[PDB]
Amino acid sequence: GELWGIHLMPPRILVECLLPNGMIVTLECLREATLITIKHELFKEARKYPLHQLLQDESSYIFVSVTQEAEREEFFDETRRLCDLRLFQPFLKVIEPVGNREEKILNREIGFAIGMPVCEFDMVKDPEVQDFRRNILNVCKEAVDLRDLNSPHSRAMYVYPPNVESSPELPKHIYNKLDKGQIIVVIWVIVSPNNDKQKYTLKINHDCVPEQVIAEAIRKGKYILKVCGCDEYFLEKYPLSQYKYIRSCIMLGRMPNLMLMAKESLYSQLPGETSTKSLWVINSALRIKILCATYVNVNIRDIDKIYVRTGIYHGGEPLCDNVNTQRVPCSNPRWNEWLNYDIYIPDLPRAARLCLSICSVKGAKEEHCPLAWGNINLFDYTDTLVSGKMALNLWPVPHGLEDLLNPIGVTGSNPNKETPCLELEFDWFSSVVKFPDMSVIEEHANWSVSREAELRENDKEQLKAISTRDPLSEITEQEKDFLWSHRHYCVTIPEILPKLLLSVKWNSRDEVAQMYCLVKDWPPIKPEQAMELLDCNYPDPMVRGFAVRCLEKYLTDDKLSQYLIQLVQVLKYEQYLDNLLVRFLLKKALTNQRIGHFFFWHLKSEMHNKTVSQRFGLLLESYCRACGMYLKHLNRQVEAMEKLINLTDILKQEKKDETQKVQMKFLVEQMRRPDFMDALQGFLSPLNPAHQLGNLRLEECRIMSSAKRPLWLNWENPDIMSELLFQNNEIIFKNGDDLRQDMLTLQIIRIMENIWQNQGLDLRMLPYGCLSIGDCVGLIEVVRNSHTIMQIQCKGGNSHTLHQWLKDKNKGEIYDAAIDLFTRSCAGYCVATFILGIGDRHNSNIMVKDDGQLFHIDFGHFLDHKKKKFGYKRERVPFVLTQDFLIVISKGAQECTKTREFERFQEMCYKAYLAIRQHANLFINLFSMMLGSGMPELQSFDDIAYIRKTLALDKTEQEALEYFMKQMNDAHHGGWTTKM
């Protein structure tokens, strides 16, 4: 709401103006008006009130008031209007402005972008937070020096980076569609103020450089090529086919349209003394006293007893047996007992954590349940072992978590203090107890192997057999002993590192020290493999440090943007606020505005979530401080989305008992107002920052049928060459539902597609844009000319209706290409949905384009989330090809299951299925990185195991292929012709 307790204030509204003489002037003013208007009306009316003699000129003063977030915000920008101020209550205090005005503007702009005031960070007393704020500025100042190094071209590379593929090489089917390795491209040029269009159609090699494309146009340097429609520029000297726009035009078979523009035109647009002791000197077992918990929300009658479950963890792995406290009544939670753990203090590894929870319990049978949970890092960010007494405010248990502890969850106290507060006490030996340096660890590693006591062919083939196991395929104790025994020989096959790391005794400084020395000179590996070592089962700083340096060397900005969702979520598993990964991501975010756009939005989307508000808020501050000119563009997006939140909240809450046309009148009325017209027009699409959103086609904007009230919005493309690419941009805003599952599902579909295209299979998927931007707030891209199956064939109490529509839309000799595209589309989506286990496909879920491209929408739940509330172990098939679909593939044959087209269709599904099976590690790693996200469908490794069962990773390639055939046959009731 725009004023606490109200959504929108009406035109007439009173405001209490507090003058600096001491008087209080109640004032009439209109809702639309600005501060300079209100200040004119104030000091005019102030003459009538006493002590107007003492008052100075209107220009001398500035308005001040309290905002929604309890900040004393000063209103320097007097063009802002009353409703956009976000006041707590309608009052304004005039005073003389003081302090650094340059900084106060920027702190407000950063505070508006983040979603909380900067002054809240200033009043944090944790030294790790203030260390981060000062230290992270080193990365920020390093980043801005990179983009200012080769100015002004490197500055243009930041704002308009080359949106390219990872490799210049093309597949066979992509290359073979070209005319002997050449593409016909149209370069447009603007003529005059009259601005009438003329074009120059060229024909040149696919791997030309943007400089060489300009040289050919001047026949028919000093210039740059821009994509018509978008704000996307080919500044870098890549091959022309490597750009995504040109590569997409080759697949789609459309004429690429570029605009010639001056290089000078674009460039002008942008600007007491301590007693320290080593850990390995402490000769003692670990013990942690649990004193008492303040309270817990338990019904005294129903629960029998309560206790404090506890355990020492290295990631997910417990380093020793879990220790419980004695069982005590619910009314008085009090323990005061030293819990003894079977582990030597020196053997505690660097990333060791205390995980604990208060647990309720109910012929000697009982159900144990978590009430609240919390985790603590045993060593703080400065390598200091925790000591003495401390309080821990416990977190609420997430939805569906039946485990008694929560090792994967974030460490640290709950900021909400009105909360169950477990008090505990660690040992105290000296003032400080430090974890040793790497030099001391090297000495113990050499010392350990000294006291201990040819790579054969049978042994060499076992290392390849073990390395081919997927991440969640558990290695055996023989394989652990084998991997450890040949740990020095494992360097020759560096992809085995994750298997070797799990074979280490992490509760043993001997074996950890020897592993540290191997990791120090370990050969680097491909980024997609290194992303495995960033999940919750690899918490050691050295192992993570190695993983980040592999990304620094080999991760392209294409793949960084591709995998950005998982890399942001992985920051939740990090023990400390300052780390190598956050520095790596932040630097890339500040040297590439495409990355920095989504980097902002992925962090911004979870600022409601109090488990990461401080980490993500601090990280956003670093970005918004250093990103420069784009902060202005992001606040326009933020203000636009916040106004769309306000209207949908009114429709959901206030206008719930109203007809849909009455809601449209209200929506159109409020959107017509000037404050909404300014905010919701002339800003970049959050789904794609290259897409400029102009004026609203307000007559064509609509509310959708759902009870949560989504808005089908429609913007003009203000680009002067919009007619070539697209004239309007349609986006679906949604306020009620969680779209993180669709966002992830659509990310995976894009990755699945990219795997198939690189491996020869031309299976065109349609991963439409879907970005979550808040607590169940997100945007969805609208595909043009997309029709559901229900639209082609009307419901009522014929099978061939689908094939008849497709033949009409693609009549003539083009028919065959449309059936091919349809058949290829169905193949990928049949395989994709079976692997991922998405919701059941019906005619409203499935959609088809005019050219014949089939695709899915509304994924929702996935990995078969309804295998809870449904005990079956069978892996269901979501997209079942009914008689309607098989006729389109088989081209009007009645025996559609026994055709050459259906056999050819089956071969694509098998080749597609094995392609994803062979890249199973990637997808398993990607899902493992999302386990801390808070999505109900990805809470534990047991949830990720669904894709192992569908891909059949505990079976042979031929057995897995045989498994796939059986599941299709059972779903199709024999229609899916067996190989026999």
Binding site: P50, L51, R72, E477, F870, G871
Partner: protein, 278 residues
């Protein structure tokens, strides 16, 4: 007697089941809890012994060559039952000093026979339908409480911020009184030594209007603090309701799973299982 028993009839042998099914059965179990399953058809070996030690699942593979089973060469044991029953009595320290633990607590596949003693297939099928309906009812009850729990948590957080915003608003209006008090001291003194009660009347009227507005704003903050205590009690009440339903959901699910396990055993048609569940 024991060593002459077949591998099929053994309580701890579970056959073709996934590593996930083993993890569920060994989760939050004591040391020496174990069961044997069929190995992965991708990897070498016949069976996989999965036992508990230090709160971790230790997978030990059982190989075979020429009528002899074991963990590594040389393969000494006659059968899998002889291998297991040996390490039921003797420690695994013999094999590897790391895991000093016996195979103490077998996860029996005749454990469900205790929980579901009734023999008839249609009777167990009907009780699975009944237990599943009680689970679906309690689950929708829990989901509805969790909707309230999150909405109540958010509305408390909205109110909590508004208390600080009220307090900053009161501070500013109290600073306005400090501004009025100090500047009006000298000016009212000029208008009292001179006869100007007309000016005092409309200055003291303005001071009353300020203090009246402070009383109303302090009331609105006072009323909100009662609404915070009201809504904070609803949060604690909803949390209590959820913590009574939580243990019921586990007991209903575990019972439903063991009833579904008993019909997964003695393989029933998937059509019949889906009819009872729905």
């Amino acid at each position: 007697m024991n060593n002459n028993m077949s591998l099929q009839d053994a309580e701890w042998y579970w056959g073709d089941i996934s590593r996930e099914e083993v993890n569920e059965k060994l989760r939050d179990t004591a040391d020496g809890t174990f069961l044997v399953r069929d190995a992965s058809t991708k990897m070498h070996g016949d069976y996989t012994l999965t036992l508990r030690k230090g709160g971790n699942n230790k997978l030990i593979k059982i190989f075979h060559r020429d009528g002899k089973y074991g963990f590594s060469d040389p393969l000494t044991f006659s059968s899998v039952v002889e291998l297991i029953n040996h390490y039921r009595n003797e420690s695994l320290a013999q094999y590897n000093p790391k895991l000093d633990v016996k195979l103490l607590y077998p996860v029996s596949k005749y454990q469900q026979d205790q929980v579901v003693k009734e023999d008839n297939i249609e009777a167990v099928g009907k009780k699975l339908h009944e237990y599943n309906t009680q689970f679906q009812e309690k689950s929708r009850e829990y989901d509805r409480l969790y909707e309230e729990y999150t909405r109540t948590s958010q509305e408390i957080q909205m109110k909590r911020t508004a208390i600080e915003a009220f307090n900053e608003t009161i501070k500013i209006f109290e600073e306005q009184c400090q501004t009025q008090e100090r500047y009006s001291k000298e000016y009212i003194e000029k208008f009292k030594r001179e006869g100007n009660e007309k000016e005092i009347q409309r200055i003291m009227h303005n001071y009353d209007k300020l203090k009246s507005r402070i009383s109303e704003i302090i009331d609105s903050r006072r009323r909100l603090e009662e609404d915070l205590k009201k809504q904070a009690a609803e949060y604690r009440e909803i949390d209590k309701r959820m913590n009574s339903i939580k243990p019921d959901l586990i007991q209903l699910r575990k019972t439903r799973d063991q009833y579904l396990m008993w019909l997964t055993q003695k393989g029933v048609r998937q059509k019949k299982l889906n009819e009872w569940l729905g």
